[PDB]
Structure 1
Amino acid sequence: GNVQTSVNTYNITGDGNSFTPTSDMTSTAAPAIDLKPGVLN
């Protein structure tokens, strides 16, 4: 968790972060991308 600084807009050990799931936003990316012949074209 050693401080980084700019590589990415957020530090992990950064000030006031917060793990907190909300039944509202089910985390996630994009797995079901459609590529099948007819559907991709």
Structure 2
Amino acid sequence: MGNASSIVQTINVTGDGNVFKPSAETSSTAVPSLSLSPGMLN
């Protein structure tokens, strides 16, 4: 999370009313790996 600065026009990092509720169902993911095998692309 951002730090050492606050901006409230749109999203106040340091303001009230924000939620920090980690859960098993929500988890966290990006794009780690794909399918780039030579035989399947052609």
Q: TM-score, normalised by structure 1?
A: 0.50
Q: TM-score, normalised by structure 2?
A: 0.50
